[PDB]
Design an enzyme around this catalytic site. Sequence first.
Site, short mmCIF file in Angstrom:
data_model
loop_
_atom_site.label_atom_id
_atom_site.label_comp_id
_atom_site.label_asym_id
_atom_site.label_seq_id
_atom_site.Cartn_x
_atom_site.Cartn_y
_atom_site.Cartn_z
N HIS A 118 -8.67 17.09 -10.02
CA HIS A 118 -10.06 16.64 -10.12
C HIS A 118 -11.00 17.59 -10.87
O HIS A 118 -12.21 17.37 -10.85
CB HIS A 118 -10.64 16.40 -8.72
CG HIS A 118 -9.93 15.34 -7.93
ND1 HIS A 118 -10.29 14.01 -7.98
CD2 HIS A 118 -8.89 15.41 -7.06
CE1 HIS A 118 -9.51 13.31 -7.18
NE2 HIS A 118 -8.65 14.14 -6.61
N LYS B 266 -26.79 13.95 -7.73
CA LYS B 266 -25.43 14.48 -7.65
C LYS B 266 -25.59 15.91 -7.16
O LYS B 266 -26.70 16.44 -7.14
CB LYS B 266 -24.80 14.47 -9.05
CG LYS B 266 -25.58 15.28 -10.08
CD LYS B 266 -25.53 14.64 -11.46
CE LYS B 266 -24.11 14.27 -11.83
NZ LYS B 266 -24.03 12.95 -12.50
N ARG B 267 -24.49 16.54 -6.76
CA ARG B 267 -24.57 17.91 -6.28
C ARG B 267 -25.19 18.83 -7.35
O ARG B 267 -25.01 18.60 -8.55
CB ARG B 267 -23.18 18.42 -5.89
CG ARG B 267 -22.63 17.78 -4.61
CD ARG B 267 -23.46 18.20 -3.40
NE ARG B 267 -23.37 19.64 -3.15
CZ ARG B 267 -22.53 20.21 -2.29
NH1 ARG B 267 -21.72 19.46 -1.55
NH2 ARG B 267 -22.52 21.53 -2.14
N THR C 291 -18.42 9.58 -10.88
CA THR C 291 -18.32 8.24 -10.28
C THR C 291 -19.72 7.68 -10.05
O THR C 291 -19.92 6.46 -10.02
CB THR C 291 -17.55 8.25 -8.94
OG1 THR C 291 -18.10 9.24 -8.07
CG2 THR C 291 -16.07 8.55 -9.20
N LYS D 112 -21.61 3.76 -10.51
CA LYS D 112 -22.49 3.09 -9.56
C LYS D 112 -23.77 2.61 -10.24
O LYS D 112 -24.24 1.49 -9.99
CB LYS D 112 -22.85 4.05 -8.41
CG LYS D 112 -21.64 4.61 -7.68
CD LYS D 112 -22.02 5.71 -6.71
CE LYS D 112 -20.77 6.42 -6.19
NZ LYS D 112 -21.23 7.53 -5.37
N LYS E 239 -23.42 20.47 -14.38
CA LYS E 239 -24.03 19.14 -14.39
C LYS E 239 -25.36 19.16 -15.15
O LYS E 239 -25.92 18.12 -15.48
CB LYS E 239 -24.22 18.64 -12.96
CG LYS E 239 -22.89 18.33 -12.25
CD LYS E 239 -23.07 18.07 -10.76
CE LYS E 239 -21.73 17.78 -10.08
NZ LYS E 239 -21.14 16.48 -10.55
C1 LIG Z 1 -11.97 20.21 -6.43
O1 LIG Z 1 -12.91 19.47 -7.25
C2 LIG Z 1 -14.09 19.06 -6.72
O2 LIG Z 1 -14.68 19.81 -5.95
C3 LIG Z 1 -14.72 17.75 -7.02
O3 LIG Z 1 -15.53 17.23 -6.26
N1 LIG Z 1 -14.37 17.16 -8.18
C4 LIG Z 1 -14.93 15.88 -8.61
O4 LIG Z 1 -14.00 14.82 -8.27
C5 LIG Z 1 -14.49 13.50 -8.66
C6 LIG Z 1 -13.45 12.44 -8.24
O5 LIG Z 1 -12.28 12.50 -9.08
C7 LIG Z 1 -14.73 13.46 -10.21
O6 LIG Z 1 -15.24 12.18 -10.60
C8 LIG Z 1 -15.74 14.57 -10.60
O7 LIG Z 1 -15.96 14.56 -12.02
C9 LIG Z 1 -15.17 15.94 -10.14
O8 LIG Z 1 -16.12 16.97 -10.48
C1 LIG Z 2 -21.06 8.77 -5.88
C2 LIG Z 2 -21.55 10.04 -5.11
C3 LIG Z 2 -21.33 11.33 -5.61
C4 LIG Z 2 -20.63 11.61 -6.97
O1 LIG Z 2 -21.64 11.60 -8.01
P1 LIG Z 2 -21.36 12.17 -9.52
O2 LIG Z 2 -22.65 11.98 -10.21
O3 LIG Z 2 -20.12 11.54 -10.03
O4 LIG Z 2 -21.12 13.65 -9.20
C5 LIG Z 2 -21.86 12.40 -4.96
N1 LIG Z 2 -22.58 12.24 -3.82
C6 LIG Z 2 -22.78 11.01 -3.29
C7 LIG Z 2 -23.55 10.91 -1.97
C8 LIG Z 2 -22.28 9.90 -3.92
O5 LIG Z 2 -22.53 8.64 -3.39
#
Ligand SMILES: COC(=O)C(=O)N[C@@H]1O[C@H](CO)[C@@H](O)[C@H](O)[C@H]1O
Ligand SMILES: *Cc1c(COP(=O)(O)O)cnc(C)c1O
EC number: 2.4.1.1
Lengths: 810, 810
Positions: free
Chosen positions: A351, A542-543, A650, A654, A548
């Site tokens: 990931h 997002k985090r 992801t 959404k 990012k």
């Molecule tokens: C160990 O990697 C992480 O901490 C993490 O949250 N990675 C995350 O995993 C998601 C699901 O595949 C990806 O969509 C994100 O791009 C990735 O940063």
């Molecule tokens: C979908 C989701 C994420 C992942 O968001 P990205 O922009 O792909 O990092 C993180 N936190 C929450 C609460 C989500 O619903």
Amino acid sequence: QISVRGLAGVENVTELKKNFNRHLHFTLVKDRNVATPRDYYFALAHTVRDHLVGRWIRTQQHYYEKDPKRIYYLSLEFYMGRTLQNTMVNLALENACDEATYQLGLDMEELEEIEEDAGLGNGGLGRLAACFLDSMATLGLAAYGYGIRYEFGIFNQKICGGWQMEEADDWLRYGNPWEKARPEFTLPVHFYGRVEHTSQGAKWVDTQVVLAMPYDTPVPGYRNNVVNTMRLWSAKAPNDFNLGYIQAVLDRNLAENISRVLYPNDNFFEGKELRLKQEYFVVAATLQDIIRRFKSSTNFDAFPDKVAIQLNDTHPSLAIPELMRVLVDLERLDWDKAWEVTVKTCAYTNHTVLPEALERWPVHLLETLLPRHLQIIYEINQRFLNRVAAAFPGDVDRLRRMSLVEEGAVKRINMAHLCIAGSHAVNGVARIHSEILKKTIFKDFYELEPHKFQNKTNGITPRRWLVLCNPGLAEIIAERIGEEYISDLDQLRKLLSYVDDEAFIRDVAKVKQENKLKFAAYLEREYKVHINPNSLFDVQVKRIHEYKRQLLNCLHVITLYNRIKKEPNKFVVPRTVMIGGKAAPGYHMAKMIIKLITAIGDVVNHDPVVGDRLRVIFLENYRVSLAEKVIPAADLSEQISTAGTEASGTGNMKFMLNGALTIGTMDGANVEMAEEAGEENFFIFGMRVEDVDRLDQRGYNAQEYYDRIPELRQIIEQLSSGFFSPKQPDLFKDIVNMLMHHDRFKVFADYEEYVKCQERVSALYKNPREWTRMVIRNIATSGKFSSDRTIAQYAREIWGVEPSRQRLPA
Amino acid sequence: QISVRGLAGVENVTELKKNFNRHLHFTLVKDRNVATPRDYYFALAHTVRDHLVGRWIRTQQHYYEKDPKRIYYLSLEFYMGRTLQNTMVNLALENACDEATYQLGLDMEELEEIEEDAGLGNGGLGRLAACFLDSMATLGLAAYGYGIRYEFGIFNQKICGGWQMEEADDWLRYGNPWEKARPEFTLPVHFYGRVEHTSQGAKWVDTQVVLAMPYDTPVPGYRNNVVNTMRLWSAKAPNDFNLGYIQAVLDRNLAENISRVLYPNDNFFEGKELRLKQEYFVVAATLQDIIRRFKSSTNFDAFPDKVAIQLNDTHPSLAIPELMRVLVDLERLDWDKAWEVTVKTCAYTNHTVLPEALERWPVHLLETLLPRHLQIIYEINQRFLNRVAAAFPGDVDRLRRMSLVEEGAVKRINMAHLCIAGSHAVNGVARIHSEILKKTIFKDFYELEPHKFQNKTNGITPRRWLVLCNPGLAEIIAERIGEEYISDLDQLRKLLSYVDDEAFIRDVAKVKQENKLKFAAYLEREYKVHINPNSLFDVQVKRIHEYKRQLLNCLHVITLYNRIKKEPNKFVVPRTVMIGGKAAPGYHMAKMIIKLITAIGDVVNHDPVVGDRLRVIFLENYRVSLAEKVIPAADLSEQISTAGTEASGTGNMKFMLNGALTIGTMDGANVEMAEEAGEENFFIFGMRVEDVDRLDQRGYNAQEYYDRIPELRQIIEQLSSGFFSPKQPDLFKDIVNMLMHHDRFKVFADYEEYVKCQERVSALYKNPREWTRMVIRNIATSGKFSSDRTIAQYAREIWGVEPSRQRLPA
Ligand SMILES: COC(=O)C(=O)N[C@@H]1O[C@H](CO)[C@@H](O)[C@H](O)[C@H]1O
Ligand SMILES: *Cc1c(COP(=O)(O)O)cnc(C)c1O
Ligand SMILES: COC(=O)C(=O)N[C@@H]1O[C@H](CO)[C@@H](O)[C@H](O)[C@H]1O
Ligand SMILES: *Cc1c(COP(=O)(O)O)cnc(C)c1O
């Protein structure tokens, strides 16, 4: 009220009402005179839960009878969010429950807001596991999610003085109506001890024992009467533990701390002993459960035909040596046969490519905590390197590069290398990410075993991320093409024939306006903050992380503010910029970015000249339940990570499914999204991966951009001079220093193109009709991003099982 | 099957069966194919629980409507035991449930054995609280039991190598179906901090906060549809507690440890900080709850008219200064008025005269943990001593003797003195005990305020201790005099007219034989040990303590063994001597006594010459559920504490009600029992209190008895020479040394008379008919020892409320 929410039959509404009253009386032990909103929420939850049990019991009985291949998804995170509404949606009980509670004089939406989020995850990785469970159940796979039942999930974020404050997420305080404790299946997990070599085989002795108690939560498929299980382990000390007397009893806490709290890091490795214990804890308990179920179906040759283990990143990587340990030490199989079974059983999903996120455990830690596993790992490494040496004779550097053991200051075990060696399949989570894996970090492995590498682009479940959070949009869509798309998202393409339909264009635009009005009201309700619903909702949730680039967004915001101050009476498209997300407690720069955001808001939101033309809001405590509210209300989705850093993303999917246009870099899944919708219907900007590489080869010099871009220079000077921190002039010195001298993510390099692109966004927004038509083109082509498509590919290409859309007798 | 167990109506049995299946399905989420005995137990428990809710809700609504005076019984212990059968008995559902489960193909008795004991007590004091709750509900009093929900109750005792081993009592492992969490009533409790004196009143600031979360358990009255509440507090850390991040979350355990475990001491004070925290924790949370309920009925003058607080010993003594703190610091009442209210509200019950059991807390502990309470205590002491000085001018020694503050090495607070000063009533628990209080330890207080001192002889509930544990006896009794005696035990006197009834004599003897056969079988089932059911069952069960003199019993056992070895072919009445009870973990001598008992058994039970004429068994893990089994099977009850040490005793009453004759000293309630039955129907022996005093004045010299009693000398020589410990010749050296040089309880002084008395017991046992007639005379006169009589006296003479036998509409 609305079609997609099911029927509200007379019989069902009557039954629901009586069972609601029954639970309020017998279960909660209360009457309508002393019942509180929380009491009503639980009465409803137990009522809905009852409808799951019958299906849950027969689904499991079904798998026992047919004995299909079982899929075990191992993850240290399951970011589930709330369960009530999701359960009603999948059981087609939403309208019935809405009517029933209405008749009882209660507002169901008010009751839903009382449920605590099951925040057992940090972000993308944990939410993907949750979406996957939903899809596996909807596709009729005999799947089981295995994880840890954290007493405390991701911390609740509070903003004080513009700074992030963390507070414990005591989500089990009032109880969890969805779970069912199964103490009868408690299993022992071993730690420490030493290895003893006897006449026949090695033995792991003198270990400390911690009990693993399982809690099962039902996972309903979408209207197919299938109910799978998510089993989470809880740590319990044995009763003879440490058995002055009082202290011995109090010390039981030491052992039970294993399942106490989730490590709050997103894309960052923290090599702490407690985390290692959690990783082995989940793996050891799960594997015993798997083998037990397998025998209750000696012939381990058929093990891979009846079992598939998917490793969500390397967190559960110890499953490989643990499986070997059990097969070799306990079952007495020869190494070669055991290894064959292990490889055919395990599959690994990567990931991330960020070096700081990769797990590399110190040998001295494994040596003390899991002595037998270390020995097995050395043996695995020995045999693997022998294979490498035979394939690439004389290539000594390749040997050291591929070793599972990393030499240096302190020896470490590269868990990713362990996973590749012991898995028959390794996949990335987006086409560009999977390609980067083969071209860079895993290049040597790809050359040795090309057949192992695959791609499985991520997806999101259209149940929670469309029907549940955006019923208005789901309804106008169903009105035109039916309800079949909810479990076959590719059908949204039929909406392409309505792009010129004036009625549809108006409905799409109306749904968005309503969502924005609702969210705008919510902000004042629970957070007392005014915003103009007529403005463009620009959101990045997002985090918080440097890759990012929430900072690039900040730079744009300040640019917009400076331009307005320069030409006050010039017209500009009104915007409400919303940024939200949690920062890991020990990530200093991330916490400083949050402070910068609130600081910018403090200045921008109180400037009389700006008026309601620009507002900057920081969305506090971003979590799954909050995502369900803000995403349907967004106009613009910010996906601006530096090219090559966001494995997939992801949240981007959404937003696309909910009617927002996207501004972003060609990174992760953004590339496939633009490909599906057409680049002309996407706002792409910035460096591509190749451009970033060229810059690195040449050497990134931030000063160059500062010297040649007047507007950028002004922003940096404002930050440095204390313009955004009057009382603390050098408050943001660390941020400026990083940006100017050691920015690993090249914020400045994409500044000009980003601002230019943002102008094109404002231009389109001024033309409501054309903005909406482009939105329709995005929604219509978001089908590929359904997690049902993702899971079907895992099933056929990795697990060797066929998905089914057949209903089970209810 | 039997009358007293209620009716098994067709409608009820049908309803029970369907609700049983409903819970098995919806509540336990299981089917008859995978259900285990534990699953069936829970299905039954939830089914019975359902029958309580309706009555529970209306009982509380009733008290709200009528607003009677409320009784609050504060105790750190509630030794409840199992709840299933007790609930069925009080609801008259036993036969119905027995029939229903029978029809489902299940044995209800087997299911009852699965329930864990709620062992939240050490012995007599904790069980008295449990019996009291039962009686208060049966007498229709608006009573509430307040305590602590210990995660771990009294430890489970294991015997290894003849030694006691302690293991954690994880009684909540599988869940508790009887309790109901009430998080909505969570209250804050303060610790540490400092006192600030402002313009208007003192303020307790900078304190650490621990949350008190209540769990309510229903307490059903006997067939009167009344269901009272027992509310137990659980400790919870606030969410901002200690808020690196991970450690802060893990440290929440520190605060929650308050309700983690019960201190396992019987009649012994251990001045540990954690114990003090538990005592204040229960008092602080309870008082806020009491005041809240009072206001929800400003005029604190009527507080004593609506509230009565009974302190079970000094453990909750902080209620006095806490009530003052709230009334003075928070409500702003003047001291004099606050004190008037406090005294009229509180009453104190003393349960011992042993110096080592009295609570005397170090001032430095209170000073740091509860600074404001210490100040209030000094003020109370100041005003109290001023009253003493005025009543006894010039008597300076009386002043220092009565002070709440004890001077010396370390200053301490005598909690008993605090309780007497702040209570309007002080009572002992047996006539002789109450007299000793006025004549010795509390003499000065009695002279100052004679009106405060009362007696309230203890009692036991005839529901659990007759109907529940001995249905056979309850039935033959009901056959002759009806069922009215179950809630009016004095009616047992009517049995006196059947002492010459051959039919009754035979039935009484038959019931005892059946109970012995059942218990004899149980010993082999769960403990694999053979015993002759034809022998006299000689039992002594109670906590192990030097004052209870299990050692004197041991001496008699060895005497019997030596006599048999001396004249092998001489006839002797066969006996099975059973001794059981737990020893406090840190009480060395007590643990040595257990080892001595098993050591004696090892020798006696394997001597071919002895045969089945004498057996010595140590009953492992004695607890409430075990008491319900062994007491109905006993022939001889051992109550041999040194005169003046057993405040009352309650086990003695249980044996008397169940058909066992009693051998004992004129101590505690034994005196009143012999008085009720007639001394000729009791086996009294040994020194009276006056005799013990004479001996102390002269000086107790154990050597004298050793020199003049040949049989005693032989026993001591056997112990010293290693006769009972071959491999460890001096194993029992500590025991011999204590007996010979520092025996505070004069074991030797009662040896001769004890052995002589035991011969008279064996003589009567040889005459079955006369033994049984004496038994009938004991059962017939045990009426006074019902806790219903005890509670009626507390109600009328202390609380100022009238007991009611009126049923509530079900
Ligand atoms: C160990 O990697 C992480 O901490 C993490 O949250 N990675 C995350 O995993 C998601 C699901 O595949 C990806 O969509 C994100 O791009 C990735 O940063
Ligand atoms: C979908 C989701 C994420 C992942 O968001 P990205 O922009 O792909 O990092 C993180 N936190 C929450 C609460 C989500 O619903
Ligand atoms: C603080 O005293 C105790 O530890 C204790 O258990 N005391 C006990 O209390 C019982 C109930 O009144 C009495 O019957 C016993 O004689 C007394 O020892
Ligand atoms: C009744 C009881 C006691 C008290 O017994 P005494 O002989 O009065 O000390 C102690 N433990 C249990 C389990 C009891 O049932």
